[PDB]
């Protein structure tokens, strides 16, 4: 969690859920499972511009 | 209001209520509503003359 927190601090990753980080230890082996939302660079921006009427008074 | 005020200043109209002047704008159209009391020329004068008694003293 501390290691992933530093990555989020430096914006190397988007975010991670701390709850899903599960660690299982059995003998020599130590199974680790984690979830990470990777950082991505924008390459497409879609804009949906909608025109509408407005009524004025006074 | 300024235009109607000039008419009242020149006695071209009797009077107008400023509050009732409402303007509605929607798209190209611009609906305008106003009230004006038109100027009129006298053509009939009715007089109701009533005679009564008066008492004097001293």
TrEMBL record, chains A, B:
Protein name as it appears in the record: Major tail sheath protein
Residues included from the entire protein: 530 to 587 of 587
